[PDB]
Amino acid sequence: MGSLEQRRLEQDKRPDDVRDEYDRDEARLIHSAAFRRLQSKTQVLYRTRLTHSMEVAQIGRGIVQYLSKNKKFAEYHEHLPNTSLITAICLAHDIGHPPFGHGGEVALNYCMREHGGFEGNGQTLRILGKLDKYTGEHGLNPTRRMLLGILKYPVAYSELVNEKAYEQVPDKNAPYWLFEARMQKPPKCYHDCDQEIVDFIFDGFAREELAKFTQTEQPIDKDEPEKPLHKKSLYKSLDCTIMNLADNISYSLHDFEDALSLGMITQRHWREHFEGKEALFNDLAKQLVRNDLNFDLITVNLFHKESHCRKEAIGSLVNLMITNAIIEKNQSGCENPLLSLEVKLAPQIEKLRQHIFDLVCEQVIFDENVQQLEFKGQKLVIELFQTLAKDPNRFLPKPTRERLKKAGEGLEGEHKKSAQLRVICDFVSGMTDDYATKFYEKLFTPSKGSIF
Amino acid sequence: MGSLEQRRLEQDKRPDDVRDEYDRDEARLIHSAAFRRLQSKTQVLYRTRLTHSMEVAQIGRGIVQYLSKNKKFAEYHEHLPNTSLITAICLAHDIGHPPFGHGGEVALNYCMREHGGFEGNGQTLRILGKLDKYTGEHGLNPTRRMLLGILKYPVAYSELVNEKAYEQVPDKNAPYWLFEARMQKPPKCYHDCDQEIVDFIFDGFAREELAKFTQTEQPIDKDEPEKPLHKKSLYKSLDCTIMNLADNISYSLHDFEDALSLGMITQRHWREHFEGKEALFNDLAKQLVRNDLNFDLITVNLFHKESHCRKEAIGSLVNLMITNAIIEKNQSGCENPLLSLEVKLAPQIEKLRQHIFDLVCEQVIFDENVQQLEFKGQKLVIELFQTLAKDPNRFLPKPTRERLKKAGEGLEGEHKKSAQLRVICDFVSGMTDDYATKFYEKLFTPSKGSIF
Ligand SMILES: [Mg+2]
Ligand SMILES: [Mg+2]
């Protein structure tokens, strides 16, 4: 089998470069157009995706550091990623996310219904492995282990999608962009047209390991037992578990901290969301003997006037989760360490992390005004994709027109159409929020737009 | 003397934390309000200060890595900073820069003429050591070595300023914000009101070392020999030399790369700026035997249609400077390694780096439209500072009103005034470009502004 430091394309380093291949991955990523676009992309609307990706990289390094010295896990030290690989994986995890976030993701998936759908994490793999113009046709040409580390869902769209969930009540009067977004969310997956990339990631493993590692589950009873739902992938690589843990800690605490600052989560919300289960903080305070973890003391410090009393509690909770990162084996039958080993929190810490994250989804993610803005990004992307798809040679830039022509060669009929719509999907998804707004305004908004 | 890992305020780590003090500095910085503000701050206007600071951190780590293995410099390996310290120093170097960049810096220095002036690098030290609300009154409370690493100019404003350079031809008809900005630029320095911070940084050194390390020079003949000019500090710490080298590589190549993309630097500009001295590339190509360094070959790749041919040359030039980082001793009489040792490029590489950077200043920094926008930031900040200074209790937020009251206590007369204007200067300088624009529009622009 192939090495983990192997790339799809041959790009050997000069003898002047003792940097390991994982550092070369970090260097290419930071100097890449896909990573620099994280500035003009916000996840909530304040906090940009670049800042979130840096905080996630910091948390992941702290996780890897904590594990690399805890001798209870000394048996697994050799399989931990290094500082450069965990950073590059953490800094790349939100690269594929489209403009306007979930509003744009639902939009592109709805437009690509007959052509493979769209999902952000799949586009992250698509950009990293092919789209980014660091190479001709191999993206940034990352190492096998880095590609595996960003593959959060190693199962294809077709193998996971349940198109019965897309079913809608007919409405002759509704425009094409007007629908319930929750019923058009894609499965978390990789795109079928990128199977070659996934083949490379998995050529360094035994095929029985691949079958066990790509196992899925059928979730049941989201509201009713017969409600149709997509299938979920079940397992991620070891490095991916570390990044996914850091990614959730930031969403649970750092987006919570921003919610306190903006006033979207009050102490009344806190004490009502924790009206029961004050032991989520208190019982932990007893076991670890940390008076700072007392529910009433940490509540006063979180909702304190002095900003140094809040950041001290946020950082205390950030440190509490990093110090409670355990590494177990997943219920996959895999014997490879990178496929069988998982990093996660202590069960009592995860209960507290989730319960803080649930208050964030309730007051921030599902705020009426936040959702109204997501729908507008849905309308904008749909209306932009339609127009770019109706006459792509009139509107698209010349290099994008070349890819669309190139994608259709050797293909005819419906396969040619899906391959060319994929290029348009990669063009729109690779837009920044302001670039997509300007592109919308040049095409539709009455008095806006300039030829330069 | 005191240790380099010592902080002004006592904030010892728990036994659960094996992170070194320099990693704790990196962790606090990333989760700090001052570092997160780098998203909404651009240096040129595209590339944000956050992205520039990440690229600088990457270059610095590559420099430290290259030096930590080159055995010609093995005698100095023990004095190199670690990965966390060089990152925190690189990620913090542009924290103090005000809104609208040099336009805002000239603005604040002009307003603070009688009250100590303003300079960005000084505010970086002021934020890191006192202003940031991570602690009560000690900022992020960084280690002594990190504070030293961001102290680019270890000489005070008063000791360097030449107020004859501020002299202006009288103009009764000109508004207060209308002046030549070049004649009101401050010296590169630290603010006199922050001498206590600088005292702490230097208590870990012998006083003779401090006198030699804080030596200055009087530059002569900017245009004419008798043209008045500020004095310059002469020496930086070892870690600061590494950060300052990375900071200049990014400005010389990464801002050059953006200039190619936006069309602000043409191949005609390149071949005319290099009409002579093609040997800046070619002679290096002969010594290192690198055909890619041929002037005509690298020109075709830099100004190529394929974006992978440009990024390959930019990264080749980024790698060429990192591989030519030498560490010598400065002409300071210092015997401490952190004060006597400097990191810099090979003389022939610096000639090429500077000559590329000169084309960036000519076509980008001094573009007429870029300068027109800088002046507008100058007008906006001046008009905002004046109004905030005329009635600070009517306009400033309550916490900022508390600091201004607190800064004036124990003082009367002109010293009280300068101390309270310093708080207003810290408030404006700590604004983001959009926050300062909204604050300007609430106060002056006819139909804009909301009470929320
Ligand atoms: Mg994320
Ligand atoms: Mg800089």
Numbering used by the authors:
A (entry chain A), B (entry chain A): 1 to 45, 53 to 459
What does the paper say about this structure?
We therefore named the dNTPase-NTase anti-phage defense system Clover and designated the dNTPase protein as Clover protein A (CloA) and the accessory NTase protein as Clover protein B (CloB). Clover defense encodes an accessory enzyme CloB that synthesizes an additional nucleotide signal p3diT that suppresses CloA activation and protects uninfected cells from aberrant nucleotide depletion. p3diT binds to CloA in an allosteric site adjacent to the dTTP binding pocket and raises the threshold of intracellular dNTP levels required to trigger full Clover immune activation.
In contrast, SpdGTPase strongly defended against phage T7 but only weakly against phage T5 suggesting a differential ability of dNTPase-NTase systems to protect against phage infection. However, unlike the octameric assembly of CloA, alterations in the SpdGTPase multimerization interface result in assembly of a hexameric complex. Similar to CloA, the core unit of SpdGTPase is an anti-parallel dimer formed through hydrophobic interactions throughout the HD domain. Differences in CloA and SpdGTPase overall complex architecture result from changes in the CloA C-terminal α-helical bundle where lengthening of helices α19 and α22 causes the CloA dimeric units to interlock at an angle that is ~30° wider and multimerize as an octameric assembly. CloA and SpdGTPase share near identical catalytic and substrate nucleotide binding site residues suggesting that CloA likely also functions as a dGTPase. We tested enzyme function in vitro and observed that SpdGTPase is alone sufficient to catalyze rapid dGTP hydrolysis.
